[PDB]
């Protein structure tokens, strides 16, 4: 009675959402972008190599300065590199060797990491004595910490395997907000240029737009046939792309609340590990589980190029705030900068 009427209300509102979206589905992005001149071939070269990690590299994140970058690796270490000089600005050993994510703070003073410890350990680079001291252990998550991004020196969003995200205030060590709703492990998240919104991708093969301010799910996007491993915003902040274990990426617009474009090829059979946009967004850099890192024309959906500089899975990748270079960490124990 009450549950069957509520189930049919759910399944009616769902087709109301499908019709509200199909109404806006007047034209595709491949049609509109047919006319514009193709991007051509993005011939990329390995500029730097960042050696020193003893095992698989699990994560990396550029600093807002475009020069420094953190990287977490299977060897239990979190290294801060100066991409320009190849020297290790820091080699922080972690209390838990099972690190999976890292995030350079926009200020550059703080760095965050986490993993199966279910804790978001925040470290301070500019310490009283100048050492690499642990500022906080943001604990409370009931699953492995899958990803996190600093809002500021004192605020940080983290995703976890409990099917939730959470905003923390580093000072109090307490979950300011908790973003519940996912039905699978949240693999990734990404703060919008406007810090009031962020999207998150999960193993439920769907993405969700969250409001940092309030803490409610505003929109939910689907289309992927497998787990979503990585997600990030379009430079402007009105769209975001998701990579999935179905060997496909997809673009979603928030204002249109539906999929715009699919990036896949019959040759491409392995899943996507990571994604990133260029400063303008014309280029989408997708990491794969075949040692490759394909460059797509975000508008044409054509595979413009390929970055093949790694012997093992291209686990992680990033782009500088100025888009001047592309970093790609991999399981071969080496990161590689590209231009």
């Amino acid at each position: 009675s009450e549950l069957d009427q509520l189930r049919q209300e759910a399944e009616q509102l769902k087709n109301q959402i499908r019709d509200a979206r199909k109404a806006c589905a007047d034209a595709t992005l491949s049609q509109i972008t047919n006319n514009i001149d193709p991007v051509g071939r993005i011939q990329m070269r390995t500029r730097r190599t960042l050696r020193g990690h003893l095992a698989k590299i699990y994560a990396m994140h550029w600093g807002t300065d475009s020069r420094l970058l953190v990287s977490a690796s299977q060897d239990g270490k979190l290294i801060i590199w100066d991409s320009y000089t190849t020297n290790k600005v820091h080699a922080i050993p972690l209390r838990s060797s099972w690190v999976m994510t890292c995030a350079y703070a926009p200020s550059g003073n703080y760095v965050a990491c986490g993993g199966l410890d279910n804790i978001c350990s925040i470290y301070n680079l500019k310490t009283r004595e100048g050492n690499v001291r642990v500022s906080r252990e943001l604990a409370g998550h009931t699953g492995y910490l899958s990803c996190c991004r600093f809002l500021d020196d004192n605020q940080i969003v983290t995703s976890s395997g409990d099917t939730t995200c959470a905003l923390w205030d580093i000072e109090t060590g307490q979950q300011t907000t908790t973003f519940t709703g996912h039905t699978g492990d949240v693999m990734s998240l990404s703060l919008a240029p406007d810090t009031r919104l962020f999207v998150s991708g999960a193993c439920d093969a769907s993405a969700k737009l969250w409001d940092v301010r309030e803490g409610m799910c505003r929109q939910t996007f689907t289309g992927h046939e497998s787990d979503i491993n990585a997600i990030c915003f379009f430079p402007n902040g009105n769209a975001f792309a998701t990579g999935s274990d179905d060997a496909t990426c997809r673009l979603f617009d928030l204002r249109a609340d539906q999929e715009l474009m699919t990036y896949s090829h019959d040759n491409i059979i392995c899943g996507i590990t990571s994604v990133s946009f260029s400063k303008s967004g014309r280029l989408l850099l997708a990491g794969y589980d075949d040692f490759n890192c394909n460059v797509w024309d975000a508008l044409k959906a054509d595979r413009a190029g390929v970055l093949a500089g790694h012997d093992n899975r291209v686990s992680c990748l990033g782009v500088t705030d100025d888009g001047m270079a592309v970093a790609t960490g991999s399981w071969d124990s080496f990161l590689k900068i590209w231009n």
Binding site: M100, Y144, G161, D185, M187, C203, T273, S315
Partner: peptide, 13 residues
Amino acid sequence: RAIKASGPGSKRL
């Protein structure tokens, strides 16, 4: 053992 018993993680690890 843990490397493979991680499921979601064993696919990203």
